[PDB]
Structure 1
Amino acid sequence: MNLTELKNTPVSELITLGENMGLENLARMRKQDIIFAILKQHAKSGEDIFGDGVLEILQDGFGFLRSADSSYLAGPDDIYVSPSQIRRFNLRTGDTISGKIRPPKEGERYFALLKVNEVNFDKPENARNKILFENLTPLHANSRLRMERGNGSTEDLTARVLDLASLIGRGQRGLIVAPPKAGKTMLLQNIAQSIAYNHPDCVLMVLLIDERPEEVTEMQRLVKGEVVASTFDEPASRHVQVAEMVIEKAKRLVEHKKDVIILLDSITRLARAYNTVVPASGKVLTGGVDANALHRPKRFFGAARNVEEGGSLTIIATALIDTGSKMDEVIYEEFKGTGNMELHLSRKIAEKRVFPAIDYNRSGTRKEELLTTQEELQKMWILRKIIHPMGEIDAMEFLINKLAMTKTNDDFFEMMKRS
């Protein structure tokens, strides 16, 4: 049977199924071991079993296959991948493998791969003919990615303010600069909801780095697209592994003319993990961060691009400021001029319960004329001109009480030009 439907199956149903199969006590161990025991029993039954997941290359071709639901954890049920199929299928990290899987025999403890019937949701030779990601030429984002849901939700103020604040397109590279307790998590949640609502075609990925378990478990039960998260319990090695896996999977998906969106919470946490995992380069900058340590995160954040031939990769990574540590400020200043989209959140607006707390005058996007049409561009320019003199709290309260009294942003434009 399928491995994913077993993994998504709740623990109580898993132990009930194991009791039906015959195992006396398969409840007092981890879920990975339970699923491994189920696989043992059903392989002893002798029936064919499906398998799928994301492929990973080790330092010597000792290939592994993880799953996104388990946050790419190195569990005993991870599917072994011999170098042989790596060689005659030309597979790298991030490939989505699916097909038959061999039950392991004496001498090995990992389920081998019998044969593949799909890679990257496509026929294997088509995957062979695909072009490698970094050979594709990037451009500026052309396709507008609208955030307004249009359902007239009472909470939809965040998406409307986002649309009027910073144009988000199919290929942007975005930063969300915010102090603690400003609404980053729910802003990302609203963005994910808008992506899953207005644009069901594009693949949506949400990556959480060393986040609190309660926020994580709220996240998998709120978004529609698959979400991967890491907690602060495990060390920085797993954070680096998960980030690398996510970026490679996104590159593989976008190599097939697909649209990928990655939400990062947060880029500062990943930068710190990279800083504390890499060996010292011999020279350290201010704040106790290695100069080479920031090389790896940039390659992540720099992966966002708009390809001519097909597909795009959008990355919205939030950054933390005013935390109280100098290395956070160093990380923020190294990323100050990197992304082409930036959104600034103000603590003063957040503490006055005027949400979403966004610093309008300090938030904007690059090449906004390419993303949207003209008349909308002059409408937004007039809006920026009129609300520029007023303060950030006053500007946000004015936008809130003007937007709440109607349903569509077009109506707001009509009333502001009419009045």
Structure 2
Amino acid sequence: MNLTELKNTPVSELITLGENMGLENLARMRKQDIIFAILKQHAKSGEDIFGDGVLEILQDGFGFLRSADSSYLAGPDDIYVSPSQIRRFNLRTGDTISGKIRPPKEGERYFALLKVNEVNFDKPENARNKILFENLTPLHANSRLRMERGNGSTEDLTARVLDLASPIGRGQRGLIVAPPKAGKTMLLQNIAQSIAYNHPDCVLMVLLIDERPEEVTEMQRLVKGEVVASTFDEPASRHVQVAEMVIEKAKRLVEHKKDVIILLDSITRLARAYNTVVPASGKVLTGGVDANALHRPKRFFGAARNVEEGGSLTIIATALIDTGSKMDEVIYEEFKGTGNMELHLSRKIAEKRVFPAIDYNRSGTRKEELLTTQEELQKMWILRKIIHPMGEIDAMEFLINKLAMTKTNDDFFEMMKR
């Protein structure tokens, strides 16, 4: 029996399946309780069960395989694995493990792994000789990630506008400056769709911190891939835990020669959660924040890199400014010159209901010549020269108007070449 099959099924179908098996009252308790009871009954039946999850090390030394469909939330059905297994097969937090599951015997409040048959989509033995994450050297991004949809639809307009504004490559550490009511989500959704279509091989995971519960559903419906989020109901501990699990899973994927892309929703929310969770170091920085608090956001953000051996790790993050909270621009002043590429959004442009509201003159990337070719580089340079004089809002209007008349980016290339 497949645990993920039960998890993916709707709750009503789970209740009906349990009632067919029996168990009497099943509707009232949560989904995790339902799946736990159904799994226990099926194990009592005798048939072997196969389950998969993402491993995590707890402070007690034990391992837990959290599930992605629950946004890595601890639950009664969370498989728990002894440190003996971790010693037997070299494992750490973020690893994806699939195998047969032991029924919960006396003293077993959760399910446990009997035999492991898959580690990070690979055999257990082949995971021992892999190299850690930052043992691999950091290298400048060189392989361009093309996120032009190419269908000519209105959705592709923002993708190509950001592409000529500031190209994004594999392994880059992007940064988005998003004032309130600027279209941050309407940009993230398009970026996620472009990544999922143009580059299906790369693993796409979306991390949302301090989000509204209603937006999580639309994010997880629109994005083809893995969406994990922590709403504002959950404490800062949950935000930190989900962020750490996501970054560790990405690092483990990179170590396994996989290419993974992370679309972080907000650096500011993560930094606030980290400031809340960490103990005080005895020194209070400006704005009621801790020096040690700001370190772990840097640890999360700096993992974006183009590994010369196994692939890339791209982390696109968005910054919140002019929110009113002073810790927000404290975090901004911490990350002034950290991102490889920076895209700036403008509130005044968004006021006229013309989108995308970006500042083309400000938005740009460093060492762009590596990602693009010579012709693209000089074309971008002359475009910067010619749209440099006119105002940013008129610049955006002219850009969207001109890209509208052109089917693709090459049509624009030939248009400004004449």
Do they superpose with TM above 0.5? yes
| 2:55 and 2:64 in contact (8 A); partners too | yes
Give matches, 1:376-415, under 5 Å.
376-415=376-415
- How far has the Cα of 1:59 moved from its partner? 1.5
Q: Is the 8 A contact 2:203 2:261 kept in 1?
A: yes
Tell me, in whole angstroms, the C-alpha distance in 1 between the residues paired with 2:371 and 2:303. Answer: 20
- SS of residue matched to 2:252: helix
- Aligned-pair CA distance for 1:257: 1.4
Is the contact made by 1:170 and 1:314 (CA closer than 8 Å) also made in structure 2? yes
Q: How far is the alpha carbon of 1:154 from its aligned partner?
A: 2.3
Write the deviation string for residues 258-301 of structure 1: whole angstroms up to 9, x where unpaired: 11111111110000000010000111111111111100110000
Q: CA deviation at 1:129?
A: 0.7
Partners in 2 of 1:406 and 1:136 — Cα distance? Answer: 42
Q: CA deviation at 1:210?
A: 1.1
SS in 1 for 2:4: helix
2:70 is matched with which residue? 70
Q: Secondary structure at the match of 2:185?
A: helix
Structure-2 separation of matches of 1:32 and 1:257: 33
In structure 2, the residue corresponding to 1:323 is in which secondary structure? coil
Contact 2:258-2:311 at 8 Å conserved across structures = yes
CA displacement, residues 227-265 of structure 1 (integer Å, 9 cap, x when unaligned) = 101100010001000000000000000001111111111
Q: Is the 8 A contact 2:55 2:65 kept in 1?
A: yes
TM-score, normalization by structure 1: 0.99
Q: Are the counterparts in 2 of residues 321 and 329 from structure 1 also a CA contact under 8 Å? A: yes
Q: CA deviation at 1:415?
A: 1.0
Is residue 256–residue 311 contact of structure 1 (8 Å, CA) maintained in 2?
no
User: What is the rounded CA distance, in whole Å, between the counterparts of 2:273 and 2:56 in structure 1?
Assistant: 20
Displacement of 1:195 in angstroms is: 0.4
Runs of 4+ in 1 over 3 A off after TM superposition: none
Q: Which runs of 5+ in 1 are unaligned?
A: none
Q: Indicate the percent of aligned positions where both proteins have the same amino acid.
A: 100
Instruction: Tell whether the 8 Å contact from 2:51 to 2:99 is kept in structure 1 after alignment.
Output: yes
When structure 1 is superposed on structure 2, of 149-158 and 181-190 the one drifting more is 149-158
Partner of 1:139: helix, strand, or coil?
Answer: coil
> 1:307 & 1:154 partners in 2: Cα distance?
35
8 Å CA contact retained: 1:267, 1:318: yes
8 Å contact from structure 2 (residues 210, 232) kept in 1: yes
- 2:54 and 2:96 in contact (8 A); partners too: yes
- 1:304 aligned to 2:318? no
Measured in 2, the distance between the counterparts of 1:372 and 1:156 equals: 20
How far does residue 9 in structure 1 lie from its aligned partner after superposition? 0.4
Written as runs of structure 1 = structure 2, the 5 A alignment for 1:203-218 is: 203-218=203-218
Q: Deviations over 1:93-139 (max 9, x none)?
A: 01100011101101121101101001000111111010011101010
User: Normalized against structure 2, the TM-score is what?
Assistant: 0.99
Contact 2:155 2:190 in 1 (8 A): no
The answer to whether the 8 A contact 1:253-1:260 is kept is yes
| Structure 1: distance between partners of 2:236 and 2:59 | 19
Paired residues in the alignment total 418
Q: Report how far residue 60 of structure 1 moved.
A: 2.8
What SS does the corresponding residue of 2:155 show, helix, strand or coil?
Answer: coil
- The aligned counterpart of 2:96 is 96
Distance apart, 1:383 and its partner CA: 1.0
C-alpha displacement of 1:406:
2.0
Q: How far is the alpha carbon of 1:26 from its aligned partner?
A: 0.4
| Partner Cα distance (2:166, 2:415) in 1 | 21
**Whole-angstrom distance in 1 between the partners of 2:396 and 2:82:** 57
